[PDB]
Tab-separated table of C-alpha atoms in Angstrom:
chain	number	residue	atom	x	y	z
A	197	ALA	CA	43.335	-4.334	-5.063
A	198	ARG	CA	39.874	-4.306	-6.878
A	199	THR	CA	37.949	-7.633	-7.424
A	200	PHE	CA	37.411	-8.774	-11.095
A	201	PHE	CA	33.711	-8.497	-11.844
A	202	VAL	CA	31.936	-10.054	-14.793
A	203	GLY	CA	28.392	-8.890	-15.315
A	204	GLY	CA	26.209	-10.744	-17.868
A	205	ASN	CA	23.329	-8.700	-19.227
A	206	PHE	CA	20.802	-11.056	-20.813
A	207	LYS	CA	18.627	-8.865	-22.119
A	208	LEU	CA	15.291	-9.296	-23.707
A	209	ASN	CA	16.310	-13.019	-24.184
A	210	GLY	CA	16.092	-16.196	-22.063
A	211	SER	CA	13.310	-18.755	-21.563
A	212	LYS	CA	12.984	-21.041	-18.507
A	213	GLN	CA	14.904	-23.705	-20.429
A	214	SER	CA	17.691	-21.344	-21.466
A	215	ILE	CA	18.001	-19.890	-17.945
A	216	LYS	CA	18.186	-23.584	-16.783
A	217	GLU	CA	21.044	-24.240	-19.134
A	218	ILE	CA	23.019	-21.021	-18.402
A	219	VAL	CA	22.994	-21.055	-14.661
A	220	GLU	CA	23.513	-24.854	-14.848
A	221	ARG	CA	26.885	-24.308	-16.709
A	222	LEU	CA	27.889	-21.629	-14.098
A	223	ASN	CA	27.369	-23.987	-11.216
A	224	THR	CA	29.646	-26.429	-13.382
A	225	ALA	CA	32.382	-24.080	-14.611
A	226	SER	CA	35.708	-23.836	-12.772
A	227	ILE	CA	36.066	-20.167	-11.847
A	228	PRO	CA	38.399	-18.435	-9.259
A	229	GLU	CA	37.142	-18.176	-5.652
A	230	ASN	CA	38.279	-14.538	-6.073
A	231	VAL	CA	35.818	-13.258	-8.928
A	232	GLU	CA	32.387	-11.456	-8.772
A	233	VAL	CA	29.753	-12.658	-11.293
A	234	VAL	CA	26.353	-11.012	-11.668
A	235	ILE	CA	23.781	-12.486	-14.200
A	236	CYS	CA	21.026	-9.977	-15.052
A	237	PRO	CA	17.928	-11.688	-16.614
A	238	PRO	CA	14.553	-10.167	-17.693
A	239	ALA	CA	12.474	-9.745	-14.532
A	240	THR	CA	10.140	-12.524	-15.658
A	241	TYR	CA	13.002	-14.999	-14.684
A	242	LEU	CA	14.892	-13.315	-11.766
A	243	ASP	CA	13.224	-15.406	-8.935
A	244	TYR	CA	13.875	-18.596	-11.015
A	245	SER	CA	17.472	-17.651	-11.728
A	246	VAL	CA	18.095	-17.218	-7.927
A	247	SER	CA	16.506	-20.783	-7.307
A	248	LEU	CA	18.953	-22.175	-9.783
A	249	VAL	CA	22.237	-20.603	-8.729
A	250	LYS	CA	24.405	-22.821	-6.524
A	251	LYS	CA	27.793	-21.169	-7.038
A	252	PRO	CA	28.647	-18.543	-4.267
A	253	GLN	CA	30.480	-16.172	-6.707
A	254	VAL	CA	27.322	-15.694	-8.811
A	255	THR	CA	24.643	-13.351	-7.566
A	256	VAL	CA	21.645	-12.185	-9.698
A	257	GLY	CA	20.568	-8.675	-10.652
A	258	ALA	CA	17.693	-6.965	-12.418
A	259	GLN	CA	18.163	-4.784	-15.566
A	260	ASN	CA	16.121	-1.652	-14.633
A	261	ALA	CA	13.996	-0.509	-11.749
A	262	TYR	CA	12.335	2.600	-10.770
A	263	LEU	CA	13.125	5.199	-8.195
A	264	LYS	CA	10.120	4.487	-5.804
A	265	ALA	CA	9.486	1.048	-4.398
A	266	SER	CA	5.682	1.110	-4.241
A	267	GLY	CA	2.809	2.839	-5.873
A	268	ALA	CA	0.939	3.492	-8.935
A	269	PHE	CA	3.755	3.229	-11.410
A	270	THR	CA	2.316	0.568	-13.700
A	271	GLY	CA	4.629	-1.474	-15.820
A	272	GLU	CA	7.651	-0.714	-13.660
A	273	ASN	CA	10.244	-2.545	-11.538
A	274	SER	CA	10.944	-2.184	-7.849
A	275	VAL	CA	13.993	-2.649	-5.882
A	276	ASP	CA	12.119	-4.092	-2.940
A	277	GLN	CA	10.470	-6.725	-5.093
A	278	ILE	CA	13.668	-7.848	-6.763
A	279	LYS	CA	15.444	-7.852	-3.346
A	280	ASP	CA	12.632	-9.997	-1.807
A	281	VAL	CA	13.122	-12.575	-4.455
A	282	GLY	CA	16.912	-12.563	-3.573
A	283	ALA	CA	18.709	-10.449	-6.185
A	284	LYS	CA	21.388	-7.929	-5.112
A	285	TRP	CA	22.069	-5.679	-8.211
A	286	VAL	CA	20.137	-3.450	-10.795
A	287	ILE	CA	21.693	-2.065	-13.992
A	288	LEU	CA	20.819	1.657	-14.193
A	289	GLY	CA	21.552	3.841	-17.216
A	290	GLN	CA	21.928	0.724	-20.585
A	291	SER	CA	22.237	1.978	-24.174
A	292	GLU	CA	19.050	0.038	-24.840
A	293	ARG	CA	17.118	2.606	-21.758
A	294	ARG	CA	18.532	6.106	-22.401
A	295	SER	CA	18.149	6.154	-26.151
A	296	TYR	CA	14.977	4.317	-26.825
A	297	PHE	CA	13.308	4.635	-23.527
A	298	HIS	CA	13.975	8.254	-22.975
A	299	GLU	CA	16.026	7.991	-19.734
A	300	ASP	CA	17.446	11.343	-18.742
A	301	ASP	CA	20.677	11.532	-16.701
A	302	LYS	CA	18.793	12.978	-13.768
A	303	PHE	CA	16.323	10.125	-14.037
A	304	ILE	CA	19.256	7.678	-13.725
A	305	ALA	CA	20.809	9.915	-10.941
A	306	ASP	CA	17.824	9.941	-8.678
A	307	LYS	CA	17.198	6.269	-9.485
A	308	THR	CA	20.750	5.422	-8.453
A	309	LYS	CA	20.489	7.235	-5.020
A	310	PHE	CA	17.188	5.404	-4.079
A	311	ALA	CA	18.649	2.022	-5.082
A	312	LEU	CA	21.705	2.417	-2.847
A	313	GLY	CA	19.246	3.902	-0.268
A	314	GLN	CA	17.538	0.441	-0.538
A	315	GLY	CA	20.486	-1.914	-0.098
A	316	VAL	CA	21.038	-2.883	-3.677
A	317	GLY	CA	24.219	-2.540	-5.600
A	318	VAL	CA	24.107	-0.565	-8.852
A	319	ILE	CA	25.717	-1.244	-12.217
A	320	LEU	CA	25.746	2.335	-13.746
A	321	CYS	CA	26.332	2.858	-17.445
A	322	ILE	CA	27.865	5.596	-19.205
A	323	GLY	CA	28.689	5.760	-22.965
A	324	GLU	CA	29.096	7.851	-26.095
A	325	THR	CA	27.516	7.283	-29.389
A	326	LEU	CA	29.766	7.165	-32.468
A	327	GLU	CA	29.111	10.826	-33.441
A	328	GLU	CA	30.132	12.138	-29.947
A	329	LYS	CA	33.196	9.817	-30.663
A	330	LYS	CA	33.705	11.291	-34.196
A	331	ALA	CA	33.819	14.829	-32.687
A	332	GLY	CA	36.201	14.053	-29.778
A	333	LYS	CA	33.495	14.327	-27.273
A	334	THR	CA	33.868	10.976	-25.361
A	335	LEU	CA	35.185	12.378	-22.106
A	336	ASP	CA	33.159	15.484	-22.337
A	337	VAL	CA	29.972	13.182	-22.472
A	338	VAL	CA	31.033	10.537	-19.842
A	339	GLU	CA	31.842	13.315	-17.267
A	340	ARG	CA	28.466	14.849	-18.113
A	341	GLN	CA	26.730	11.575	-17.273
A	342	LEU	CA	28.772	10.856	-14.188
A	343	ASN	CA	28.369	14.416	-12.905
A	344	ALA	CA	24.559	14.117	-12.791
A	345	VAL	CA	25.046	10.974	-10.547
A	346	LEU	CA	27.823	12.794	-8.604
A	347	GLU	CA	25.555	15.739	-7.800
A	348	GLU	CA	23.155	13.194	-6.190
A	349	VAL	CA	25.251	10.361	-4.742
A	350	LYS	CA	28.344	10.683	-2.488
A	351	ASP	CA	29.199	7.129	-1.349
A	352	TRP	CA	29.878	4.908	-4.220
A	353	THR	CA	30.988	1.913	-2.303
A	354	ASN	CA	28.365	-0.474	-3.819
A	355	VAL	CA	28.458	1.164	-7.250
A	356	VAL	CA	30.200	-0.262	-10.335
A	357	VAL	CA	30.513	1.871	-13.532
A	358	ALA	CA	30.066	0.194	-16.893
A	359	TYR	CA	31.615	2.075	-19.800
A	360	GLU	CA	29.754	1.044	-23.304
A	361	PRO	CA	30.816	2.505	-26.208
A	362	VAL	CA	27.341	2.601	-27.771
A	363	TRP	CA	29.061	1.827	-31.105
A	364	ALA	CA	30.457	-1.431	-29.726
A	365	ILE	CA	27.053	-2.605	-28.373
A	366	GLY	CA	26.537	-6.008	-29.763
A	367	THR	CA	27.990	-5.139	-33.126
A	368	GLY	CA	31.092	-7.399	-32.909
A	369	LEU	CA	33.632	-4.551	-33.039
A	370	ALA	CA	34.854	-3.683	-29.657
A	371	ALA	CA	37.384	-0.913	-28.554
A	372	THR	CA	41.031	-2.104	-28.524
A	373	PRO	CA	42.334	-2.816	-24.923
A	374	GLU	CA	44.645	0.123	-25.437
A	375	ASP	CA	41.790	2.627	-26.490
A	376	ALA	CA	39.687	1.382	-23.586
A	377	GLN	CA	42.496	1.787	-20.996
A	378	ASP	CA	42.888	5.513	-21.786
A	379	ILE	CA	39.258	6.301	-21.287
A	380	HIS	CA	39.015	4.102	-18.157
A	381	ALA	CA	41.930	5.764	-16.498
A	382	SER	CA	40.455	9.164	-17.643
A	383	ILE	CA	37.163	8.391	-15.963
A	384	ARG	CA	38.986	7.239	-12.826
A	385	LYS	CA	41.143	10.377	-12.283
A	386	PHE	CA	38.025	12.473	-13.056
A	387	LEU	CA	36.343	10.312	-10.376
A	388	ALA	CA	39.519	10.714	-8.124
A	389	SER	CA	39.344	14.482	-8.157
A	390	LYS	CA	35.535	14.362	-7.541
A	391	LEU	CA	35.356	11.591	-4.845
A	392	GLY	CA	38.757	11.088	-3.230
A	393	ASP	CA	41.733	8.923	-4.297
A	394	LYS	CA	40.597	6.103	-1.947
A	395	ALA	CA	37.046	5.939	-3.514
A	396	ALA	CA	38.290	6.414	-7.042
A	397	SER	CA	40.694	3.594	-6.158
A	398	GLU	CA	38.113	1.220	-4.952
A	399	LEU	CA	35.479	1.775	-7.774
A	400	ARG	CA	35.338	-0.934	-10.506
A	401	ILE	CA	35.204	0.250	-14.114
A	402	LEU	CA	33.851	-2.384	-16.436
A	403	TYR	CA	34.298	-2.212	-20.170
A	404	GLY	CA	31.216	-3.267	-22.178
A	405	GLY	CA	30.497	-3.614	-25.936
A	406	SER	CA	31.244	-6.709	-28.081
A	407	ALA	CA	33.188	-8.339	-25.248
A	408	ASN	CA	33.426	-12.087	-26.032
A	409	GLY	CA	35.366	-15.315	-25.455
A	410	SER	CA	38.319	-14.594	-27.639
A	411	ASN	CA	38.970	-10.912	-27.120
A	412	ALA	CA	38.716	-10.905	-23.300
A	413	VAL	CA	42.390	-12.065	-22.883
A	414	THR	CA	43.590	-8.975	-24.764
A	415	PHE	CA	42.198	-6.876	-21.853
A	416	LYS	CA	44.173	-9.124	-19.402
A	417	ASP	CA	46.921	-6.672	-18.407
A	418	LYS	CA	44.807	-3.486	-18.227
A	419	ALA	CA	44.830	-2.052	-14.721
A	420	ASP	CA	41.865	0.281	-14.905
A	421	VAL	CA	39.755	-2.224	-16.702
A	422	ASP	CA	38.327	-3.952	-13.694
A	423	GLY	CA	36.033	-6.360	-15.384
A	424	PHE	CA	33.562	-6.644	-18.180
A	425	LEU	CA	29.911	-6.107	-19.047
A	426	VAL	CA	28.981	-8.949	-21.223
A	427	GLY	CA	25.672	-8.621	-23.122
A	428	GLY	CA	25.716	-10.835	-26.156
A	429	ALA	CA	27.935	-13.676	-24.928
A	430	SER	CA	26.279	-13.702	-21.478
A	431	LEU	CA	23.908	-16.142	-23.092
A	432	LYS	CA	26.768	-18.080	-24.786
A	433	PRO	CA	29.157	-20.730	-23.289
A	434	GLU	CA	32.167	-18.507	-24.002
A	435	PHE	CA	30.926	-16.518	-21.032
A	436	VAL	CA	33.095	-18.666	-18.716
A	437	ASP	CA	36.082	-17.811	-20.967
A	438	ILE	CA	35.561	-14.077	-20.336
A	439	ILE	CA	35.332	-14.883	-16.519
A	440	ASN	CA	38.557	-16.871	-16.652
A	441	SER	CA	40.184	-14.315	-18.944
A	442	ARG	CA	42.663	-13.207	-16.339
A	443	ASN	CA	42.936	-16.842	-14.938
B	172	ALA	CA	-24.093	-11.335	-24.081
B	173	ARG	CA	-20.718	-10.175	-22.665
B	174	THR	CA	-18.925	-12.198	-19.943
B	175	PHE	CA	-18.263	-10.339	-16.642
B	176	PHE	CA	-14.665	-9.262	-16.513
B	177	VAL	CA	-12.700	-7.993	-13.512
B	178	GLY	CA	-9.005	-7.046	-14.110
B	179	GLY	CA	-6.788	-6.481	-11.000
B	180	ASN	CA	-3.964	-4.093	-11.846
B	181	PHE	CA	-1.687	-4.363	-8.767
B	182	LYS	CA	0.664	-1.552	-10.250
B	183	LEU	CA	4.055	-1.252	-8.428
B	184	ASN	CA	2.943	-3.247	-5.348
B	185	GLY	CA	3.358	-6.628	-3.605
B	186	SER	CA	5.711	-9.156	-2.023
B	187	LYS	CA	5.742	-13.038	-2.242
B	188	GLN	CA	3.766	-13.340	0.945
B	189	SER	CA	1.276	-10.651	-0.293
B	190	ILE	CA	0.758	-12.282	-3.620
B	191	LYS	CA	0.563	-15.645	-1.644
B	192	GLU	CA	-1.930	-14.144	0.706
B	193	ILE	CA	-4.014	-12.557	-2.050
B	194	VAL	CA	-4.178	-15.600	-4.479
B	195	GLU	CA	-5.286	-17.893	-1.631
B	196	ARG	CA	-8.350	-15.689	-0.811
B	197	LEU	CA	-9.618	-16.147	-4.366
B	198	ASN	CA	-8.276	-19.688	-4.414
B	199	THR	CA	-10.866	-20.480	-1.756
B	200	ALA	CA	-13.630	-17.714	-1.828
B	201	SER	CA	-17.060	-17.970	-3.483
B	202	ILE	CA	-16.685	-16.523	-7.051
B	203	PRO	CA	-19.300	-17.008	-9.850
B	204	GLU	CA	-18.421	-19.469	-12.581
B	205	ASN	CA	-18.246	-17.501	-15.864
B	206	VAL	CA	-16.758	-14.344	-14.502
B	207	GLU	CA	-13.272	-13.563	-15.820
B	208	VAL	CA	-10.732	-12.501	-13.250
B	209	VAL	CA	-7.202	-11.490	-14.395
B	210	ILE	CA	-4.668	-10.526	-11.716
B	211	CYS	CA	-1.843	-8.403	-12.909
B	212	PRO	CA	1.154	-8.485	-10.438
B	213	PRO	CA	4.644	-7.050	-10.988
B	214	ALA	CA	6.731	-8.983	-13.568
B	215	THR	CA	8.950	-10.397	-10.759
B	216	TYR	CA	5.953	-12.172	-9.285
B	217	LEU	CA	4.317	-13.489	-12.456
B	218	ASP	CA	5.687	-17.069	-12.472
B	219	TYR	CA	4.972	-17.606	-8.757
B	220	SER	CA	1.468	-16.175	-9.172
B	221	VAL	CA	0.723	-18.680	-11.916
B	222	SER	CA	2.178	-21.562	-9.714
B	223	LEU	CA	-0.169	-20.336	-7.019
B	224	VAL	CA	-3.403	-19.866	-9.031
B	225	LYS	CA	-5.735	-22.775	-8.695
B	226	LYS	CA	-9.278	-21.329	-9.181
B	227	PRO	CA	-9.813	-21.650	-13.014
B	228	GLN	CA	-11.600	-18.305	-13.720
B	229	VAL	CA	-8.553	-16.453	-12.395
B	230	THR	CA	-5.684	-16.009	-14.927
B	231	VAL	CA	-2.553	-13.939	-14.425
B	232	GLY	CA	-1.563	-11.090	-16.791
B	233	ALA	CA	1.444	-8.759	-17.016
B	234	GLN	CA	1.213	-4.981	-16.411
B	235	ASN	CA	3.377	-3.933	-19.495
B	236	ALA	CA	5.326	-5.443	-22.497
B	237	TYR	CA	7.295	-4.388	-25.655
B	238	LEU	CA	6.541	-4.575	-29.378
B	239	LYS	CA	9.326	-7.252	-29.908
B	240	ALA	CA	9.938	-10.620	-28.394
B	241	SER	CA	13.664	-10.961	-27.928
B	242	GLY	CA	16.626	-8.635	-28.515
B	243	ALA	CA	18.592	-5.727	-27.303
B	244	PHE	CA	15.923	-3.913	-25.209
B	245	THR	CA	17.098	-3.842	-21.554
B	246	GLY	CA	14.406	-3.578	-18.773
B	247	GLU	CA	11.461	-4.557	-21.044
B	248	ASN	CA	9.105	-7.476	-20.579
B	249	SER	CA	8.359	-9.806	-23.559
B	250	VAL	CA	5.089	-11.119	-24.752
B	251	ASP	CA	6.594	-14.600	-25.026
B	252	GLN	CA	8.194	-14.730	-21.583
B	253	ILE	CA	4.864	-13.856	-20.018
B	254	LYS	CA	3.397	-16.658	-22.069
B	255	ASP	CA	6.416	-18.836	-20.939
B	256	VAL	CA	5.669	-18.244	-17.335
B	257	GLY	CA	1.903	-18.737	-18.115
B	258	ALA	CA	0.247	-15.315	-17.883
B	259	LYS	CA	-2.445	-14.987	-20.596
B	260	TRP	CA	-2.980	-11.209	-20.681
B	261	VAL	CA	-0.959	-8.051	-20.960
B	262	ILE	CA	-2.385	-4.647	-19.723
B	263	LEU	CA	-1.300	-2.163	-22.473
B	264	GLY	CA	-1.916	1.582	-22.738
B	265	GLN	CA	-2.753	1.184	-19.905
B	266	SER	CA	-2.921	4.818	-18.908
B	267	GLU	CA	0.384	5.116	-16.901
B	268	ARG	CA	2.486	4.312	-19.131
B	269	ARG	CA	1.273	7.269	-21.293
B	270	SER	CA	1.829	9.914	-18.591
B	271	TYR	CA	5.061	9.188	-16.838
B	272	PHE	CA	6.611	6.919	-19.332
B	273	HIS	CA	5.458	8.648	-22.414
B	274	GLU	CA	4.056	5.849	-24.529
B	275	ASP	CA	2.593	7.548	-27.606
B	276	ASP	CA	-0.600	6.002	-29.137
B	277	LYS	CA	1.052	4.386	-32.026
B	278	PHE	CA	3.689	2.768	-29.766
B	279	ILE	CA	0.714	1.188	-27.980
B	280	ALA	CA	-1.061	0.240	-31.213
B	281	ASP	CA	1.951	-1.627	-32.652
B	282	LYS	CA	2.565	-3.284	-29.241
B	283	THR	CA	-1.129	-4.379	-29.312
B	284	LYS	CA	-0.845	-5.843	-32.807
B	285	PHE	CA	2.294	-7.753	-31.934
B	286	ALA	CA	0.884	-8.791	-28.610
B	287	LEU	CA	-2.281	-10.271	-29.998
B	288	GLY	CA	-0.334	-11.815	-32.804
B	289	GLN	CA	1.777	-13.548	-30.196
B	290	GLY	CA	-1.345	-15.100	-28.768
B	291	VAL	CA	-1.524	-13.103	-25.461
B	292	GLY	CA	-4.819	-11.152	-24.649
B	293	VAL	CA	-4.589	-7.331	-24.426
B	294	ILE	CA	-6.345	-5.267	-21.808
B	295	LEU	CA	-6.193	-1.894	-23.646
B	296	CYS	CA	-6.643	1.326	-21.663
B	297	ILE	CA	-7.945	4.647	-22.956
B	298	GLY	CA	-8.898	7.994	-21.189
B	299	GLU	CA	-8.533	11.778	-20.923
B	300	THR	CA	-6.930	13.937	-18.339
B	301	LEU	CA	-8.638	16.694	-16.344
B	302	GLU	CA	-7.271	19.038	-19.020
B	303	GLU	CA	-9.028	17.363	-21.856
B	304	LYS	CA	-11.977	16.945	-19.465
B	305	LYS	CA	-12.668	20.622	-18.523
B	306	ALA	CA	-11.766	21.707	-22.169
B	307	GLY	CA	-14.391	19.211	-23.458
B	308	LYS	CA	-11.871	17.127	-25.429
B	309	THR	CA	-13.017	13.748	-23.872
B	310	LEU	CA	-14.469	11.927	-26.802
B	311	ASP	CA	-12.067	13.061	-29.513
B	312	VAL	CA	-9.161	12.040	-27.338
B	313	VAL	CA	-10.448	8.477	-26.836
B	314	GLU	CA	-11.500	8.186	-30.537
B	315	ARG	CA	-7.852	9.231	-31.441
B	316	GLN	CA	-6.317	6.686	-29.021
B	317	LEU	CA	-8.666	3.942	-30.258
B	318	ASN	CA	-8.382	4.935	-33.897
B	319	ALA	CA	-4.590	4.566	-33.574
B	320	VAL	CA	-5.087	0.962	-32.509
B	321	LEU	CA	-7.952	0.431	-35.008
B	322	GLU	CA	-5.684	1.193	-37.918
B	323	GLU	CA	-3.261	-1.607	-36.821
B	324	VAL	CA	-5.413	-4.274	-35.243
B	325	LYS	CA	-8.319	-5.645	-37.393
B	326	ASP	CA	-9.706	-8.399	-35.109
B	327	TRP	CA	-10.732	-7.564	-31.477
B	328	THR	CA	-11.637	-10.951	-30.032
B	329	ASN	CA	-9.061	-11.052	-27.236
B	330	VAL	CA	-9.106	-7.370	-26.549
B	331	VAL	CA	-10.998	-5.821	-23.571
B	332	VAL	CA	-10.957	-1.949	-23.627
B	333	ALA	CA	-10.638	-0.133	-20.323
B	334	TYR	CA	-11.719	3.425	-19.949
B	335	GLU	CA	-9.719	4.990	-17.071
B	336	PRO	CA	-11.300	8.502	-16.568
B	337	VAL	CA	-7.863	9.870	-15.627
B	338	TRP	CA	-9.796	12.304	-13.354
B	339	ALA	CA	-10.405	9.254	-10.969
B	340	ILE	CA	-7.486	6.780	-11.251
B	341	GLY	CA	-5.918	6.879	-7.766
B	342	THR	CA	-7.453	10.391	-7.061
B	343	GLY	CA	-10.122	8.545	-5.015
B	344	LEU	CA	-13.360	9.625	-6.793
B	345	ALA	CA	-15.486	7.418	-9.187
B	346	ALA	CA	-17.174	9.499	-11.794
B	347	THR	CA	-20.800	8.318	-11.831
B	348	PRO	CA	-22.447	5.099	-12.868
B	349	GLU	CA	-24.439	7.491	-15.175
B	350	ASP	CA	-21.673	9.432	-17.096
B	351	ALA	CA	-19.636	6.181	-17.066
B	352	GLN	CA	-22.541	4.405	-18.764
B	353	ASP	CA	-22.624	7.206	-21.355
B	354	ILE	CA	-18.908	7.192	-22.049
B	355	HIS	CA	-18.855	3.395	-22.594
B	356	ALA	CA	-21.971	3.461	-24.744
B	357	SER	CA	-20.379	6.357	-26.803
B	358	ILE	CA	-17.177	4.410	-27.383
B	359	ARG	CA	-19.158	1.188	-28.051
B	360	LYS	CA	-20.815	2.852	-31.034
B	361	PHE	CA	-17.556	4.446	-32.299
B	362	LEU	CA	-16.121	0.886	-32.362
B	363	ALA	CA	-19.281	-0.331	-34.038
B	364	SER	CA	-18.571	2.316	-36.674
B	365	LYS	CA	-15.158	0.808	-37.208
B	366	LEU	CA	-16.067	-2.977	-36.771
B	367	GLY	CA	-19.831	-3.336	-37.202
B	368	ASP	CA	-22.482	-3.976	-34.618
B	369	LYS	CA	-21.383	-7.552	-34.378
B	370	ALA	CA	-17.915	-7.039	-33.080
B	371	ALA	CA	-18.859	-4.209	-30.817
B	372	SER	CA	-21.733	-6.262	-29.391
B	373	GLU	CA	-19.306	-8.800	-27.898
B	374	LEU	CA	-16.255	-6.650	-27.076
B	375	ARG	CA	-15.905	-5.597	-23.368
B	376	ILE	CA	-15.330	-2.066	-22.111
B	377	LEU	CA	-14.346	-1.949	-18.469
B	378	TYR	CA	-14.691	1.066	-16.255
B	379	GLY	CA	-11.248	1.907	-14.682
B	380	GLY	CA	-10.956	4.920	-12.241
B	381	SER	CA	-11.659	4.219	-8.539
B	382	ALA	CA	-14.043	1.184	-8.579
B	383	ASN	CA	-14.364	-0.694	-5.130
B	384	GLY	CA	-16.222	-3.114	-2.805
B	385	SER	CA	-18.552	-0.470	-1.480
B	386	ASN	CA	-19.660	0.852	-4.896
B	387	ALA	CA	-19.311	-1.824	-7.620
B	388	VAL	CA	-22.992	-2.679	-7.314
B	389	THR	CA	-24.046	0.884	-8.436
B	390	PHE	CA	-22.384	0.022	-11.798
B	391	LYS	CA	-24.527	-3.121	-11.961
B	392	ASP	CA	-27.508	-2.401	-14.286
B	393	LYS	CA	-25.283	-0.355	-16.495
B	394	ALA	CA	-25.129	-2.201	-19.795
B	395	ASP	CA	-22.008	-0.991	-21.359
B	396	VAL	CA	-19.905	-1.184	-18.261
B	397	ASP	CA	-18.914	-4.789	-18.786
B	398	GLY	CA	-16.427	-5.167	-15.958
B	399	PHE	CA	-13.819	-3.328	-13.875
B	400	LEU	CA	-10.026	-2.680	-13.871
B	401	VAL	CA	-9.414	-2.393	-10.206
B	402	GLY	CA	-6.071	-1.022	-9.064
B	403	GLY	CA	-5.955	-0.424	-5.399
B	404	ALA	CA	-8.745	-2.801	-4.313
B	405	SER	CA	-6.983	-5.784	-6.003
B	406	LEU	CA	-4.709	-5.934	-2.981
B	407	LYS	CA	-7.429	-5.453	-0.494
B	408	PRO	CA	-10.039	-8.140	0.244
B	409	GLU	CA	-13.041	-6.170	-1.329
B	410	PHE	CA	-11.626	-7.354	-4.682
B	411	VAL	CA	-13.715	-10.497	-4.014
B	412	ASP	CA	-16.809	-8.330	-3.343
B	413	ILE	CA	-16.223	-6.701	-6.718
B	414	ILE	CA	-16.236	-10.107	-8.584
B	415	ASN	CA	-19.702	-10.753	-7.073
B	416	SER	CA	-21.095	-7.133	-7.562
B	417	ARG	CA	-22.963	-8.367	-10.514
B	418	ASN	CA	-24.793	-11.317	-9.082
């Protein structure tokens, strides 16, 4: 049906030694032939991380890039440059970009149609902050985020959606598998009625936010929870345990 | 006296073969000893550029970084990972960053304090738009931008300032050798106000705004123009002509 995807966002972490030891353990882990693993390092180690990977199921992605591949856009990342180096994914739209780094939904929307225009796969994130949660505004916000992408992008084959309760981001208190299933399935029938039942049925919807070694098995029999976006334990050994969580 | 300095801000531009092509031209061309050349590629290509650099004057620097070193800040570059890959400089303030990406002056200041503290040199940019230019806001804008820094950073030994007349950067006109001289000299004495004659006497102010092979020699017997922050011509081969403009 859909393939189980485990994305590992490293974040502003990782040195050449630590990238050596993480992608060394992934080449040594015993994972299913039938699993999709994307490690997303800081751009300063993407080229290195692709030198190091020797397991076919693990491709490498960047964590942010800009919506034009060349020019005077100092400080920025480019899809063409990460692609040259051999990476196949870019995370667009993290709780650590939109809040702090002032990324407006249209900014992510336009960014997401140029990336797919360029061959790369996108990891798109959507998420409500605890007050939007306190006021029963979760779906109302997620649809608002998705709809800006939706007004721009119409083939979402190489798109994955990453739902991140902002209040579960690397706090240690995740959603329960049950709470997460409801919203995932809600996002999918919203995305059925906006894209088709076939495309809504192919799209992967990753849960993100305090996902870790021991709680991944509780999300084991959750149909609309197609994988995981692992931030904090992406740089821990229990990362293979979240990749073998349905194994 | 002040050492000649030539910074090469590549912006969002390059590929492995281009950065290979470019570093080899400097790796073998005639360049004065005691000139200071810093090439600033995209973050993806920083590690490789350092493996490629062989001519000692030439160090690599990153085009932008955050005010923290590790953590939850997706898409950001870290002062330590640039150091890890071996770049010795970070362009900050630079000017773009203020316009499209909205970096306020104090964001820059704090990022300069932390950056120097981390032991990485700062190329610091300053400048006014055509709207502060025709209004006659020029000097009080730069004094505000520099004052912001000045309150945080109280040692300026590994700082080079860059004045990008924003009415020139990528527009394709270089505001004269004469009014350039006068803006640098103005801002050298404002710094001397805030750090004494001593500090100001050794600090470098580089003219940014369209500098190139054909014209870098008309900035030659200009005293306060201590170097250049080349954008576009860094890619091109006249970048070598600009390291020899001052003979």
